[PDB]
């Protein structure tokens, strides 16, 4: 029993606190999700969707009860040792659930020094600047990874790339709330980036005299708001509701900012794959240097990585980022004509999950 | 893709504050039975072990780190909602990339019972107990009754042996022995016991002038310490490892004390099955209405009930119960040459889960 996806779609994603989704509360954002793909899908016999599992870093059962899915639709919730997309793909190759919504929600812990904004765990913020230490990444690696991210993200909205998949938030009259990522920084340049102030200042390794701190806010992913979606069924549930099937996740895996490389090892060996087979790598941009340390471990190409942008540029979405970075590659694997996507990020005490999806 | 029950085990059951396994951690509950696993199986690749999977009401990471398992298995804590230990092991392995999961879970130290201060567990829920109690007629002689029997049955099954392969006693640190028996267990229990005993718990259903509060310490299950795990696998798994495959998991379904009824009609239709099919069911003993309730709306045989005694006698030994209660079955059915049990529980904020094995 092969897991395709059949849809994957999102929320743009809203700055905490003073930003436009902040009196915005969880369930509507998963709600309003719901309705778009009931809009988009006004046939689907809701009775085959077993199960809402929602991300968050009582909603899950909460979410079914106000998007009106059936009594019959359980929620699971997951803050361990596993995540949303990958519970809902074994749950539909196990062969006993037909069809499953994964995703999450965020709404409002580590703060740039300048803005008082979540970027978001201490100790996270201190291991990064540990690999920075360990790996030779400068302040000017770890800045120049921002502005890339920055860069492919503002030819992404503007080239018109999140255009589907991308859900304008709406008021309780319909007038349009937010459309699009605004934290997004696409004036960042090298000389602004620069000026930013260190916002993190160990025993086994005893050779380091100093951490080199270059972690910043412009460098770590701030925290936002939104949610997430990817609709995952069989075959024969999707050609039952005459749904065309999007992608097929080919294989995932699971195995303290390092969990994503075995992770995405072990994905590959499961599938059968080499890095070369791969066209697009997608990892969580938690911080930079933790990517640059992924790219680094397995010789992973530029030109394949985080191609439309990440989350030091549109934000973290803690929850919802699993079905989000999914939904991207699934997105952008159909506009190039390619053929596979690796997705990775930490789950994450110390854990990685890795999901390889083929178009 | 098959996912067969290969071993089922389960430590005693300790009653908690003053009983055996008071100080003992319950990482160690957990270790002991993976080192009772590495006996019987001396020449088992662990490797193969993908995830422990350990529910509780970071315990599972740490688990795997102490029992030195591998560094590839991973832990998974239930505490993640809506999910269950062995429904999760069956599906993982269903799904292909997983080989060998642990799953199970552990208990040690809210409604207690009025005289000797015991945990029987959450106080609205004996209220909700006492509510179904007052629906469906069931008096405070049902409860007890209910209660009665549930001694009796697994005072026979303890003295039966039937518990024997599968129940591993607890140890110190220099090897003696803490506890090799269901201490909670009360076979002197009578009607004229439970009928002195205390009631614990004294517009939805506004026809309902007052409740028939009949719930009490002795109706109601007691918490207890305990571990328990199933070692779940795929057919090419156990015959890599030369394992004996004793139970096939047939399916399993998910769905404020009614849940299991549903779970089980939805268990039932995905096997292509009816209650005819089944030669034993084993649902979980909170509360006796809520047991008598189960048995009314499904038609379940008497003698096809918790036939071995339920957590009323034994313990209600929380994120353990669905591992353990799973391994009475797999043990059950090869005692009796019996082919299908029925496995139920609640998850469970409201959600109630089954299981249909099938002896192999
Ligand atoms: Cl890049």
Not at 33 to 50: A, F, G, K, W
Not at 133 to 155: I, M, P
Not at 311 to 322: D, E, F, R, W, Y
Request: aromatic share 6%.
């Amino acid at each position: 029993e092969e897991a395709f996806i059949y849809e994957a779609i999102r929320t743009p994603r809203g700055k905490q606190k003073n930003g436009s989704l902040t009196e915005v509360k969880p369930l509507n954002l998963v709600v309003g999700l719901v309705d778009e793909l009931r809009r988009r899908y006004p046939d689907l016999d809701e009775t085959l969707i077993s199960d809402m599992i929602l991300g968050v870093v009582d909603i899950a059962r909460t979410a079914v009860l106000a998007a009106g899915l059936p009594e019959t639709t359980g929620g699971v919730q997951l803050n361990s040792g596993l995540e949303a997309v990958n519970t809902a793909a074994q749950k539909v190759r196990s062969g006993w659930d037909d069809l499953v919504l994964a995703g999450g929600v965020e709404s409002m812990w580590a703060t740039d020094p300048e803005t008082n904004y979540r970027i978001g765990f201490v100790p996270q913020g201190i291991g990064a600047d540990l690999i920075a230490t360990l790996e030779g990444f400068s302040r000017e690696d770890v800045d120049a990874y921002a502005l890339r991210s920055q860069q492919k993200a503002a030819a992404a909205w503007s080239g018109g790339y999140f255009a589907k998949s991308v859900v304008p938030v709406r008021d309780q009259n319909g007038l349009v709330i937010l459309d699009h990522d605004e934290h997004m920084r696409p004036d960042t340049t090298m000389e602004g980036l620069a000026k930013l102030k260190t916002a993190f200042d160990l025993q086994k390794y005893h050779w380091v005299e100093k951490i080199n701190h270059v972690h910043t806010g412009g460098n770590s992913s701030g925290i936002v708001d939104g949610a997430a979606l990817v609709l995952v069924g069989s075959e024969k549930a999707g050609k039952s509701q005459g749904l065309t099937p999007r992608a097929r996740i080919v294989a995932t895996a699971t195995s303290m900012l390092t969990g994503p490389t075995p992770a995405t090892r072990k994905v590959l060996d499961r599938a059968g794959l080499t890095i070369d087979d791969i066209d697009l790598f997608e990892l969580n941009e938690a911080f930079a240097s933790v990517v640059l340390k992924f790219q680094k471990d397995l010789n992973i190409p530029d030109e394949k990585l985080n191609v439309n942008g990440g989350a030091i540029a549109m934000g973290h979405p803690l929850g919802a980022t699993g079905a989000m970075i999914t939904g991207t590659m699934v997105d952008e694997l159909e506009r190039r004509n390619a053929r596979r996507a690796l997705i990775t990020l930490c789950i994450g005490g110390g854990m990685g999950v890795a999901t390889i999806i083929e178009r």
